[PDB]
Amino acid sequence: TLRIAWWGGQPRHDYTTKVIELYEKKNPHVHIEAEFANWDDYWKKLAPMSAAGQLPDVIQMDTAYLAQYGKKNQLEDLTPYTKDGTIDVSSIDENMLSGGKIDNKLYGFTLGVNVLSVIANEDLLKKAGVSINQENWTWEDYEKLAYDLQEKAGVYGSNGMHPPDIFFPYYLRTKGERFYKEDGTGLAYQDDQLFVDYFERQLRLVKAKTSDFIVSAITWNYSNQYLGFARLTDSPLSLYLPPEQMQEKALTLKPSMLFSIPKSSEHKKEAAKFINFFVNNEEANQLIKGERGVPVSDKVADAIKPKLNEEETNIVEYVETASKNISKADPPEPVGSAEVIKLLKDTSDQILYQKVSPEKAAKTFRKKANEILERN
């Protein structure tokens, strides 16, 4: 047998089960045993197995945990299986895969990509008499919009860019900088005024009447999350490119999730054959239909687009457009990023809700973050 595991909701469980049944029909000698759970319970399951050396042969993995599990050669490098043909990448661009690489080894194979977006309620934009020119609106343009939306529609401008470990790095990209060094040993940006300018704008918005409720004309999220909001909201919603991405190509092709193979598996070829099937089989992807993010193969993408309805189509058309003006994905979050993230959240509300000056909070943050990461 081959063991396979993932997290998600019940719709995902249902079609993933159907994908596995299809695989077994086409591969009778391979039985698959599935385990699955919501996000929280899933890591609860996988964490003890990781160190006990008994993970499933195919592991659904998240970028924020890839570096941790890839410790001490615990994950199998997938790069050679892309080279011997086990995993076909002839229709998968490199730019879909780099969010799963650490030190030039592919510890996770990306199953789908997401792109940050400003998701807007069209009825509430109209009500306030405002609109978004997504191709080149600026951060100043966004702040105006949030103010205008409140005083002319009584609705929040936005949920707010939460959390800060996602949208401060986005801000940095809009200014041509980066949060993590690619090698994960420290923060890349060195100019504390980037930090100051980010959290001063957060101050202005949070202390304003203009500050989830999207079912708030505006919500900040990854593109995949639009499906939930668009199905929930009777108003029409649209994905817009976020402010000031054009100049430095601030958006990236973020792995929604990845498949990995643990080095302890005794079924690596069969595991990799399943991953190849998952990302390249047209029939399987008529069942997945983009729910795990935009498919990485342009052949699979072409194959499912006719079947997608309005909301799913909006996502694919958003990602396809954004993807022509992107920068290189971040590597998986480095070990100790959990501490950095907690430090950033704690520093955020010392700024927003205590009177901690952003200039003081800035150097102080950068200080301790670099000491966390310095351990590599």
List, as one string, the DSSP characters of 49-86.
HHHHT---SEEEE-HHHHHHHTGGG-BPP-HHHHHSSS
The H or E element spanning position 238 is strand 237-240
Name the β-bridge partners of 114.
254
Q: How many domains, in total, are found in the chain? A: 2
In sequence order, the 6+-apart residues with CB closer than 8 A to the CB of 234 are none
Segments forming the whole domain that contains residue 357: 112-255+321-376
Strands laid side by side in the 218-222 sheet: 218-222, 116-121, 237-240
Rg (the chain; Cα; Å)? 21
Output the domain CATH number for residue 130: 3.40.190.10
Name the β-bridge partners of 110.
258
Map residue 203 onto helix, strand or coil.
helix
CA 51: distance to chain centroid?
26
Token output for 309 = 């309805």
DSSP assigned state of 324:
G
Q: After which residues is the chain broken (C to N over 2.5 A)?
A: 211, 215
75 contacts 60 by C-beta, under 8 angstroms? no
Number of continuous H segments (helices) and E segments (strands) in the chain? 15, 10
Cβ burial of 1 (10 Å; 0-12, 13-18, 19+) is exposed
Do 348 and 212 lie in one domain? The reply is yes
Do 340 and 216 lie in one domain? The reply is yes
Sign of the CA dihedral running 274, 275, 276, 278: positive
Alpha carbon distance 175, 119 (integer Å): 22
112 contacts 296 by C-beta, under 8 angstroms? yes
Cβ burial of 335 (10 Å; 0-12, 13-18, 19+) is middle
296 contacts 110 by C-beta, under 8 angstroms? yes
Residue 289 to residues 20, 186, 233, 279, 312: CA-CA distances in angstroms?
15, 38, 21, 11, 8
User: Which of 239, 220, 243, 229 minimizes the C-alpha distance to 160?
Assistant: 220
Do 50 and 66 lie in one domain? The reply is yes
Q: Domain end: 297, 320, 343, which one? A: 320
Tell me, what amino acid is at 295?
Answer: P
Map residue 283 onto helix, strand or coil.
helix
Alpha carbon distance 275, 371 (integer Å): 37
Do 203 and 352 lie in one domain? The reply is yes
Diameter of the chain measured on Cα atoms: 65
Do 335 and 373 lie in one domain? The reply is yes
DSSP assigned state of 330:
P
> C-alpha angle with apex 201: 198 to 207, nearest 5 degrees?
135
CA 367: distance to chain centroid?
27
